[PDB]
User: Fold Probable endochitinase from Caenorhabditis elegans.
Amino acid sequence: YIRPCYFTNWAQYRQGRAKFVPEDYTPGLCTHILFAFGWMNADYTVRAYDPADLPNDWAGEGMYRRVNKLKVTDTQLKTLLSFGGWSFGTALFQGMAASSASRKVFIDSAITFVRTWGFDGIDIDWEYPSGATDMANYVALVKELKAACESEAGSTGKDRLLVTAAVAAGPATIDAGYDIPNLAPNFDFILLMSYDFFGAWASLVGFNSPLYATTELPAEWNGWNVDSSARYWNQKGMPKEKIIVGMPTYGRGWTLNNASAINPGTSGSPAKITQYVQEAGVGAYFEFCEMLANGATRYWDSQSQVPYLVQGNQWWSYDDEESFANKMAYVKREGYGGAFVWTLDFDDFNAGCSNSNGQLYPLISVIAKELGGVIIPKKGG
Ligand SMILES: CCCOc1ccc([C@@H]2c3c(-c4ccccc4O)n[nH]c3C(=O)N2Cc2cccnc2)cc1OC
Assistant:
């Protein structure tokens, strides 16, 4: 079972208990660490996102080496350099993928870059390719990228670089952007972004990552859930061993319009900002645990098999130990390739919740143990 985890190189800048560096990783937590993110130049060459990624005078070894140095104490761990994300937008992807020669510049620059900095593969999180032009250029990029990685491996004798992508879970996005049959043979696996189905961008109070649909939400959304999107990628021609189910350690929240209307499918505006994530409508597991300690009421959605909590006018959809174990039993029963996490930094990665029994990574640990057979230690002696 492939169990990748996203490392974000800006989580080191969060405050106090939220500060996350690679040294907070613990062996066997993941089989793959995706480094979010690598960056691009206007000419589509590759560069570091953060100067602190490279060995420097101020931070020292730098985040690339500090993440890759994790492979000495986790001897089966592989790393990948990810490109894109939502903040990256699409204008630079659209230009880079526009021609054989613009793609090759990125492809050659990227393969060189990852071999220089110790990564075992290249992850494309273009969010999102859209339309016939994009759809064909995206298929050309992944085929040409894999083609170059095979060559480089053939020439060098090294194990071939991995070629993955974080991909959309929404049916309309999936249709407008991805020629799956022409993509599947050139991908090692895809990180299915089976979350952000509902969110503060809209008034519809819903679930970030419902495993199944619920009749509490209007039928028009029956496809916006983990099970439907994974099936959709399988049905369009991605093999299951390549579909890695996405797992959020963050949650999405709302300021209710009516404090006594607390059911899924009510209406609201973005949630109040939380202390450490500092993004309205988003919040981390280590923040939700404190809400539960400070009086929030925990609810379980039986149809969608995920929790929500309510505290005053604050309504939060999130994931916990129960929803994680239910999604992992889901992954095994249905035979998908494994599960990945967005992100390591939103789990209670240091058993720092006031409520914590000491378990490091209470959420991600369930994936190590239920998919990997790995027991993550408790903090302390
Ligand atoms: C669909 C709209 C959801 O809104 C999102 C906004 C941003 C990201 C996230 C992100 C950020 C970012 C980081 C910390 C705090 C605020 C931010 O806006 N910077 N780059 C990225 C990124 O790619 N994100 C999404 C992502 C990429 C790959 C895999 N999983 C998630 C995410 C949002 O949800 C997508």
About this structure: Residues 85-87, 125, 166, 193, 196, 279, 342 surround EA9 (CB under 6 Å). The CA atoms of residues 241 and 337 lie 4 Å apart. The longest strand covers residues 32-40.
